[PDB]
Amino acid sequence: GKSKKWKEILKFPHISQCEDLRRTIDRDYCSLCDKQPIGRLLFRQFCETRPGLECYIQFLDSVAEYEVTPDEKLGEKGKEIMTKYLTPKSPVFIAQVGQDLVSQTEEKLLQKPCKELFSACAQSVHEYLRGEPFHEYLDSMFFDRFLQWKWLERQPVTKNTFRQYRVLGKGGFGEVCACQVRATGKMYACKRLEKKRIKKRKGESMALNEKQILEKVNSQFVVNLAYAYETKDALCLVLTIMNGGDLKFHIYNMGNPGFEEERALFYAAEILCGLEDLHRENTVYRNLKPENILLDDYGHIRISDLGLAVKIPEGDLIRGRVGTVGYMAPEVLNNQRYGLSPDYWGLGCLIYEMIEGQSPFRGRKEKVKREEVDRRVLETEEVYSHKFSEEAKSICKMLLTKDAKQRLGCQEEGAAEVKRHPFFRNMNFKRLEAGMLDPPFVPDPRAVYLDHTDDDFYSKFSTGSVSIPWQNEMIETECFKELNVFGPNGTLPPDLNRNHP
Numbered sequence: 260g261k262s263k264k265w266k267e268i269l270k271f272p273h274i275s276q277c278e279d280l281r282r283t284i285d286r287d288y289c290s291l292c293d294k295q296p297i298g299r300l301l302f303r304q305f306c307e308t309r310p311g312l313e314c315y316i317q318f319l320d321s322v323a324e325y326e327v328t329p330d331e332k333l334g335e336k337g338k339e340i341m342t343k344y345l346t347p348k349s350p351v352f353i354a355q356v357g358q359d360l361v362s363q364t365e366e367k368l369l370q371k372p373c374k375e376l377f378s379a380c381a382q383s384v385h386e387y388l389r390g391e392p393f394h395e396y397l398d399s400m401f402f403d404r405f406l407q408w409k410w411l412e413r414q415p416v417t418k419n420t421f422r423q424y425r426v427l428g429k430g431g432f433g434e435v436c437a438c439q440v441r442a443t444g445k446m447y448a449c450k451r452l453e454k455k456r457i458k459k460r461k462g463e464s465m466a467l468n469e470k471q472i473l474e475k476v477n478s479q480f481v482v483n484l485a486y487a488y489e490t491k492d493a494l495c496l497v498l499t500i501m502n503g504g505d506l507k508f509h510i511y512n513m514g515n516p517g518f519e520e521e522r523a524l525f526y527a528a529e530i531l532c533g534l535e536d537l538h539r540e541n542t543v544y545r546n547l548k549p550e551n552i553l554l555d556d557y558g559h560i561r562i563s564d565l566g567l568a569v570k571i572p573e574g575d576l577i578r579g580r581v582g583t584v585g586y587m588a589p590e591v592l593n594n595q596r597y598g599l600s601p602d603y604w605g606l607g608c609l610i611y612e613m614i615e616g617q618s619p620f621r622g623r624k625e626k627v628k629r630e631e632v633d634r635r636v637l638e639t640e641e642v643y644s645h646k647f648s649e650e651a652k653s654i655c656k657m658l659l660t661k662d663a664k665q666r667l668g669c670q671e672e673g674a675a676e677v678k679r680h681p682f683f684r685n686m687n688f689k690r691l692e693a694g695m696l697d698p699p700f701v702p703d704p705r706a707v708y709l710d711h712t713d714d715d716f717y718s719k720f721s722t723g724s725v726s727i728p729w730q731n732e733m734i735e736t737e738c739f740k741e742l743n744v745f746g747p748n749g750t751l752p753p754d755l756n757r758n759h760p
């Protein structure tokens with residue numbers, strides 16, 4: 260439900276207003292033609308204009324198809340790409356790949372198909388497009404149009420930018436509205452943080468830390484920040500909305516308690532991919548527990564509640580002793596200096612609890628004081644049942660290795676070590692990362708499953724819209740599709756023409 264007036268509020272500014280942006284935007288190929296959703300479409304749209312560029316995009320498109328293709332049909336899709344782009348006769352023959360590079364891929368398929376067959380040629384294409392095609396696209400009307408989208412992105416976010424609907428919960432610092440953008444109609448979830456609740460607690464530092472972690476992560480498996488605006492009586496964090504309920508609910512109230520191993524595997528796989536993205540920024544999450552893994556409407560999961568997460572300077576350790584009783588890694592309970600390893604401890608606790616329907620150190624039916632829980636965590640070896648394949652016992656007791664020095668993924672290799680583990684022997688992370696795999700359970704839609712130091716913090720926190728999620732909102736809500744229109748027969752529309760404003 261877009262507002263009746265949306266075409267105006269999202270009206271492109273005239274190109275003449277974007278001059279500041281033009282000189283300040285850093286002209287990085289990978290950012291402007293790929294990381295930024297709308298710049299990606301604008302560049303691809305620029306390549307369709309000239310013919311002989313268009314085959315390079317058609318190629319990269321099919322490589323992406325081939326990299327997820329079911330392993331049974333991998334080489335079958337390879338042959339098709341070979342007879343379309345890697346053969347001199349074909350009309351969409353890509354020449355900047357070189358007759359060398361293709362002759363090598365020709366025997367790569369004769370030497371059995373792997374997902375990285377065409378990865379060679381693809382880089383050859385990206386190395387070319389970064390060159391001449393990019394700098395034409397910059398001095399073209401499609402980057403002028405990209406600047407207009409950026410102009411709208413940087414526009415100021417206020418309470419009137421949204422519609423705050425039913426409240427889905429209550430939080431430590433405030434309630435969690437279910438807000439909608441007026442112009443686009445996209446649904447999000449507000450995290451309302453009452454003012455004085457921060458002021459009395461001196462929680463500014465941990466509030467700003469959360470906002471900053473949230474906006475620096477672009478992951479499918481971690482809640483994303485789309486907006487950070489301040490109001491007269493709160494500070495809002497607009498995030499990904501997740502209505503599928505949380506994992507705790509599905510482990511216990513929907514479960515046996517517990518999942519089939521194959522069901523738990525899917526969840527683990529995504530949680531693992533989620534942790535990998537946090538760990539690219541060398542950020543540690545530390546709050547892994549079932550009730551913090553949320554499900555969306557399609558049935559996929561994301562990691563929620565990052566208020567306990569901190570960036571770690573590369574090659575430096577942190578100290579904490581924070582978390583939840585029974586989901587705290589040994590090194591945390593001992594208040595030792597640690598790195599990212601607590602998060603693989605948490606993976607072990609999440610895979611165990613999903614298969615067995617209870618914590619690896621606390622019976623679902625057990626009364627135990629906090630002390631004995633921790634004692635077990637540090638001293639007792641957990642037990643497994645016939646609910647666990649050999650493969651699943653293995654991964655868990657490796658992730659639940661007391662000594663974080665011999666714990667999975669805690670070596671230089673990292674999460675790559677964990678994906679290889681035989682528990683994911685049947686999991687295809689490329690297709691998972693691509694959404695090709697169907698979640699095991701799909702949730703039914705209609706279900707319930709006062710000074711200047713503050714003025715400083717306020718403005719540091721209230722930075723506005725986040726770039727990547729805001730451009731995705733435009734595309735998703737077909738606001739890009741409708742508004743991104745040019746002139747009849749490839750001519751300058753009036754908003755991109757300097758001759759008449």
Ligand SMILES: Nc1ncnc2c1ncn2[C@@H]1O[C@H](COP(=O)(O)OP(=O)(O)OP(=O)(O)O)[C@@H](O)[C@H]1O
Pocket residue numbers: 427428429430431435448482498499500501502553563564
């Ligand atoms: N991404 C989201 N989408 C929809 N609702 C969400 C989302 N994230 C959190 N919530 C809701 O927020 C409510 C709980 O609030 P919140 O997590 O902020 O603090 P809490 O419940 O007091 O405990 P804690 O923060 O320590 O986990 C729940 O009702 C949950 O459904």
Ligand SMILES: [Mg+2]
Pocket residue numbers: 430431564
């Ligand atoms: Mg919270």
